[PDB]
Design a protein around this ligand. Structure first.
Ligand SMILES: *[C@@H]1O[C@H](CO)[C@@H](O[C@@H]2O[C@H](CO)[C@@H](O)[C@H](O)[C@H]2NC(C)=O)[C@H](O)[C@H]1NC(C)=O
Ligand SMILES: *[C@@H]1O[C@H](CO)[C@@H](O)[C@H](O)[C@H]1NC(C)=O
Ligand SMILES: *[C@@H]1O[C@H](CO)[C@@H](O)[C@H](O)[C@H]1NC(C)=O
Lengths: 112, 49
């Protein structure tokens, strides 16, 4: 249901913003001004571009020296709702030299 | 004048920060609101090469 994220300062074409989307075939990334999805629902001059309850997806999103840095992990889980009390280390994914820096963010969701 | 730079506005860039913005620069903290004059001016200055 969760397909990706939006990051930036204004998120509204006044300045550049970072768009990350999983389209089930691929992961696809851009930084752009325009808002194809202006609001976070998704149907069931860009300066950078890149491509690549039962399950828990974990991420750390981090932003340093104009790089955007991502770490992740997957596991199946059995706890009623919450993040399972325990420990397992997240691993680096990608490290993107996008030059944006971020004050505000949002997620993207698939809907009918 | 195709070759251009910022003067001031506000606080500095961070290392490798890709600024792209084109809102009016403050010379002073007025409600500049797209009007140039005192306190308010265009966000690009350009070389007389
Ligand atoms: C990077 O984050 C900063 C905030 O730390 C954003 O805000 C402006 O940053 C510029 C420097 O480029 C300053 O001149 C302004 O004073 C800041 N304004 C505010 C309201 O903080 C900046 O827009 C972000 N830039 C990018 C490219 O993402
Ligand atoms: C690219 O986007 C910025 C805002 O993010 C805008 O100021 C600029 O005019 C756009 N580029 C062109 C060629 O218009
Ligand atoms: C997913 O994104 C890639 C890269 O843009 C594209 O080739 C592919 O057709 C997309 N898949 C779908 C289902 O839209």
């Amino acid at each position: 249901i969760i397909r990706g994220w939006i990051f930036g300062t204004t998120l509204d074409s006044k300045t550049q913003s970072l768009l990350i989307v999983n389209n089930a075939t691929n992961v696809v990334i851009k930084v752009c001004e325009f808002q194809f999805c202006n609001d976070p629902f998704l149907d069931v001059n860009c300066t950078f571009e890149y491509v690549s309850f039962k399950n828990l997806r974990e991420f750390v999103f981090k932003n340093i020296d104009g790089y955007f840095k991502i770490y992740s992990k997957h596991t199946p889980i059995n706890l009623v709702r919450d993040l399972p009390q325990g420990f397992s280390a997240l691993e680096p994914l990608v490290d993107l030299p996008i030059g944006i820096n971020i004050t505000r963010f949002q997620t993207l969701l698939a809907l009918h | 004048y195709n070759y251009r730079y910022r003067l001031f506005r506000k606080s500095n860039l961070k290392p490798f920060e890709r600024d792209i913005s084109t809102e009016i620069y403050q010379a002073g903290s007025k409600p500049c609101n797209g009007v140039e004059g005192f306190n308010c001016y265009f966000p690009l200055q350009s070389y007389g090469f």
